[PDB]
Amino acid sequence: FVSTGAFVCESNPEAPKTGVCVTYTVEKVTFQGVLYESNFTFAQYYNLLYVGSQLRYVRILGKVYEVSSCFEASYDVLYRNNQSFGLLYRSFDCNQL
Amino acid sequence: CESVDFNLFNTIFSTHRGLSNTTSVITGAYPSTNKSDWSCNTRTGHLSGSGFGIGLYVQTPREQYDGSGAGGYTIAVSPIHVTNLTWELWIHRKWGVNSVVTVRLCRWWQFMSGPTNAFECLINGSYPTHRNTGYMFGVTWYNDLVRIVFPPTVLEMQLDGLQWERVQFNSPVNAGHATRFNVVKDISTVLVETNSGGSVFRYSYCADGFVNGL
Amino acid sequence: FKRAVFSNCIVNYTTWVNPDQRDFQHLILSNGKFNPFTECNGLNRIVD
Ligand SMILES: *[C@@H]1O[C@H](CO)[C@@H](O[C@@H]2O[C@H](CO)[C@@H](O)[C@H](O)[C@H]2NC(C)=O)[C@H](O)[C@H]1NC(C)=O
Ligand SMILES: *[C@@H]1O[C@H](CO)[C@@H](O)[C@H](O)[C@H]1NC(C)=O
Ligand SMILES: *[C@@H]1O[C@H](CO)[C@@H](O)[C@H](O)[C@H]1NC(C)=O
Structure with a gap:
């Protein structure tokens, strides 16, 4: 192994699924969220992009995906008994969907 | 040399991540801003x-x-x-x-x-x-x-x-123009500022004066 | 002996042995068995 980071790998990676929360791991940086297609273009030196300190864009197979936080990862239980409880998702906005 | 474009230095700097709208401090082997380091105008056949x-x-x-x-x-x-x-x-x-x-x-x-x-x-x-x-x-x-x-x-x-x-670099001497070359010796430290998409558009080397170090 | 540089490419299944399935079987471990190394130094031996 003359170099670290040349990365011979079986089975070339494929386009990810846009619209489901999944914990990715892209170029030594693991993160969790959903992806969507964007018309945002950034510098070819970089695949990851940071706005401040949060990951905002990834670039996979030449396609730029804007990273969003998945809002349904956490909930409270308004617990009364075994057959009656309520659920509250404190960080999800259910105005539309 | 004499016609070294210092506004082309922006295209070679990179931060370690992709950063947007951000002023950052980077270091490494970067080309000298001194015009007395660009071997540019040799007509002696030793442009090599x-x-x-x-x-x-x-x-x-x-x-x-x-x-x-x-x-x-x-x-x-x-x-x-x-x-x-x-x-x-x-x-x-x-x-x-x-x-x-x-x-x-x-x-x-x-x-x-x-x-x-x-x-x-x-x-x-x-x-x-x-x-x-x-x-x-x-x-x-x-x-x-x-x-x-x-x-x-x-x-x-x-x-x-x-x-x-x-290094043993070499260009065709006595050509239509004269491409300029810069052999770097020591690493530097540069203050860069990136744009919207992550491209550097301003720089200042930290050891080129008093204000640059501040 | 001729060498090969492997970088930025896709290695393929068991195309470093002869297609007979009796000889190479000393490099078989488990159901995941495509392991071309025997003793490793000092990296972790299993290639997955
Ligand atoms: C990086 O900076 C530019 C310039 O400040 C930002 O562009 C602005 O974006 C807002 C939307 O949030 C617009 O209302 C402004 O009109 C834009 N200004 C200009 C001059 O274009 C950009 O959004 C910033 N952030 C990135 C790229 O993530
Ligand atoms: C949720 O609503 C349904 C309505 O039939 C019923 O099971 C119950 O009233 C509520 N709570 C739970 C824990 O099911
Ligand atoms: C390098 O690439 C050229 C052009 O494809 C080819 O002719 C040559 O054999 C290659 N050399 C090696 C060592 O791969």
Whole structure:
């Protein structure tokens, strides 16, 4: 192994699924969220992009995906008994969907 | 030299991440802003020269109004005490004026000068580049981290041991123009500011004055 | 002996042995068995 980071790998990676929360791991940086297609273009030196300190864009197979936080990862239980409880998702906005 | 474009230095700087709208401090082997380090105007036939540095940066002057006369910049970076199992680099270009350059970091068996083919070659590709208003590139071996910077892209390989010092660069002398070369000796520290998408558009080297260090 | 540089490419299944399935079987571990190394120094031996 003359170099670290040349990365011979079986089975070339494929386009990810846009619209489901999944914990990715892209170029030594693991993160969790959903992806969507964007018309945002950034510098070819970089695949990851940071706005401040949060990951905002990834670039996979030449396609730029804007990273969003998945809002349904956490909930409270308004617990009364075994057959009656309520659920509250404190960080999800259910105005539309 | 005399006509070194210092506004082309923006195209070669990179931060370690992709950062948006951000002022950052980067360090490494970056080209000298002193005009007394750009070997540019040699008419003696020794435009070849050599260097004992840690990288080299090349800047083609301008291509807007010779024509077909472009740079050649044959670069043969040497692992100063050469054996059979060491690594050399040989970046080559002809007059063009079309795109095709070549890199070919291979493992050769002699020192005198780039045959048809060699054994055990790590990178071997064309990677074509188009001429711009003015173009600037450079390759870097600082603690054996090879960085071939052809803007916009980049190529990085951390090899375990090279000990590259000798450069043996060479351009076609007495050409239509004179491409300028910069052999870097020590690492610097630069204050850069990136734009919307992550591209550097302002720089200041930290050791070029009193205010620059503040 | 001729060498090969492997970088930025896709290695393929068991195309470093002869297609007979008796000889190479000393490099078989488990159901995941495509392991071309025997003793490793000092990296972790299993290639997955
Ligand atoms: C980086 O900076 C630019 C410039 O400040 C930002 O562009 C602005 O974006 C807002 C939307 O949030 C617009 O209302 C402004 O009109 C834009 N200004 C200009 C001058 O274009 C950009 O959004 C910033 N952030 C990035 C790229 O993530
Ligand atoms: C949820 O609503 C349904 C309505 O039939 C019923 O099971 C119950 O009233 C509520 N709570 C739970 C825990 O099911
Ligand atoms: C390098 O690339 C050229 C062009 O494809 C080819 O002719 C040559 O054999 C290659 N050399 C090696 C060592 O792969």
